[PDB]
């Protein structure tokens, strides 16, 4: 079937994070930086039994392995926050020629000294400052909120088209800030209700906000 | 073995031929380089392993050529469902390394931003702090500069900004930018203005406004 990952992680520098990746050939332990590229972890074949590492990582990182094997970081830094995938790369056959990849959900690992907080759901209001035409701008800006991630809908979704949820900043303070906006016609900022719903699971805390001008 | 990918960004139109470069600093052993695609919030796909050898599902508009510290990644017709980032991957006698992919973006019309701003709301006035938020909406190339002006004194190092991705549907970009003031200093001043700068505007554009 499938690789299964453990669910998302928040550490503390200097802390360590064990993933763990559990199958349905060599498993690879990559990660990904927000906004960067991929980077290779590590590796671990169950036939010797020995994982192969990156000189980077050389000192701090432990790969071993029910069919589970798990990746534990040590001595976690800012830089460590990260989606973190195992991989398999195995051969099929099929019309005799020999190719496939599978890949685990990945798994949120978020170091920092910030603890979990739910986020503020102000109105960004439509105004004459942001109507071009007869097309106006509206939105909800969510700040302060950790960690990663947070989901945004407009009218329970009924309002997807025009709609931009950007990604999120990280603040000098350690907390992550957000904003969703849509643009609607400008003759509807009276006769029609909008409302942005924020979702951030990592602390439970929903949001529905109306957003009037004036 | 650091590998450097070409070109950083390319800006095709669905239908035409895409290039795609990864040279590497050393041999590679031999058959033992890969390609991967990624679009946003998914994990990489295998499109091609081994140089040569492609990858289950993987259709034949992709083929991968090269050997040595040259490789490349060629799609015949670019689909809209092509359009992503792409890395190539060694994996023998290494460390194994990446590299740092390449950008497949729709070319389209220069297209201007919708320039709206948008002032502190009362409740986190109430709360203690202060954020104006600039929007760009829907431009087109991704590259764009803002600048924001407190009484016209320019400010720096307290804005930030984010982009979308390229939008499904008119492959344009949108960007917003937050000021983050104090209650006191956001009191203490009145106009409070945007200035955007892009290719497709004849004028940069400012989006100003008072307090009250």
């Known amino acids: 079937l499938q690789l299964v990952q453990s669910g998302a992680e928040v550490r503390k520098p200097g802390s360590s994070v064990k993933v763990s990746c559990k199958a349905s050939?060599?498993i690879s332990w990559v990660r990904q930086a927000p906004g960067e590229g991929l980077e290779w972890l590590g590796v671990?074949?169950?036939?010797?039994?020995?994982?192969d590492y990156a000189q980077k990582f050389h000192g701090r990182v432990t790969i071993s392995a029910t069919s589970t094997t798990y990746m534990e970081l040590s001595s976690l830094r800012s830089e460590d926050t990260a989606i973190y995938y195992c991989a398999k790369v195995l051969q099929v056959g099929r019309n005799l020629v020999v190719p496939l990849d599978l890949w685990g959900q990945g798994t949120l690992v978020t170091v920092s000294s910030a603890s979990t907080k739910g986020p503020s759901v102000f109105p960004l209001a439509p105004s004459s400052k942001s109507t071009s035409g007869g097309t106006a701008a509206l939105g909800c800006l969510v700040k302060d909120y950790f960690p990663e991630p947070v989901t945004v809908s407009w009218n329970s979704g009924a309002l997807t088209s025009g709609v931009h949820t950007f990604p999120a900043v990280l603040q000098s303070s350690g907390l992550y800030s957000l904003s969703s906006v849509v643009t609607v016609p400008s003759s509807s900022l009276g006769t029609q209700t909008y409302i942005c719903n924020v979702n951030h699971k990592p602390s439970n805390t929903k949001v529905d906000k109306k957003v009037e001008p004036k | 073995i650091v590998l450097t990918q070409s070109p950083g960004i390319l800006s095709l139109s669905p239908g035409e031929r895409a290039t795609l470069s990864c040279r590497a600093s050393?041999?590679?052993?031999?058959?033992?380089l890969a390609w991967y695609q990624q679009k946003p919030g998914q994990a990489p796909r295998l499109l091609i392993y081994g140089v040569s050898s492609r990858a289950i599902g993987i259709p034949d508009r992709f083929s991968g050529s090269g050997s040595g510290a040259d490789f490349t990644l060629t799609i015949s017709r670019l689909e809209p469902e092509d359009f992503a980032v792409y890395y190539c991957?060694?994996?023998?006698?290494?460390?194994?390394?990446f590299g740092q992919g390449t950008k497949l973006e729709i070319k389209r019309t220069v297209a201007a931003p919708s320039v709206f701003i948008f002032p502190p709301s009362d409740e986190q006035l109430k709360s203690g702090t202060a954020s104006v938020v600039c929007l760009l909406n829907n431009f087109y190339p991704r590259e764009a500069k803002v600048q924001w002006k407190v009484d016209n004194a320019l400010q720096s190092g307290n804005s930030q900004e984010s982009v979308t991705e390229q939008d499904s549907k008119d492959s344009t970009y949108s960007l917003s930018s937050t000021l983050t003031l104090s209650k006191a200093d956001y009191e203490k001043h009145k106009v409070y203005a945007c200035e955007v700068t892009h290719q497709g505007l004849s004028s940069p554009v400012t989006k100003s406004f008072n307090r009250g």
């Open positions: 991957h060694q994996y023998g006698n290494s460390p194994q390394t």
């Open positions: 050393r041999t590679i052993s031999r058959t033992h």
């Open positions: 050939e060599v």
């Open positions: 671990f074949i169950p036939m010797f039994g020995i994982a």
